Amino acid sequence: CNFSDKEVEDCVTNRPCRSQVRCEGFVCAQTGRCVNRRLLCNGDNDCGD
């Protein structure tokens, strides 16, 4: 048959999105992982990069 049994299309949406899950910690710049503020400068790469 064929690969790709799924299609995704772009949309325009007025609907609001609440995806902004809060991060009290440090939001990693590239990865956006929410690391605890205590893990900065501990010598471990707890974020990415």
Partner 1 sequence: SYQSINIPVTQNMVPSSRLLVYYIVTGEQTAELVSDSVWLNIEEKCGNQLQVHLSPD
Q: Which residues bind partner 1 (CB under 8 A)?
A: 24-25, 36-37
Q: 9-27 b/e with 16+ CB inside 10 Å = b? A: eeeeeeeeeeeeeeeeebe
Region near Ca ion per CB under 5 A, out of 9-17, 22-30, 41-49: 41-49
Q: Per CB under 5 A, does 39 bind Ca ion?
A: yes
Q: Per CB under 5 A, does 44 bind Ca ion?
A: yes
Q: Of Ca ion, partner 1, none, which one sits near residue 44, judging by CB under 5 to 8 A according to partner kind?
A: Ca ion
Residue pair 40/26 in contact by the 8 Å Cβ criterion: yes
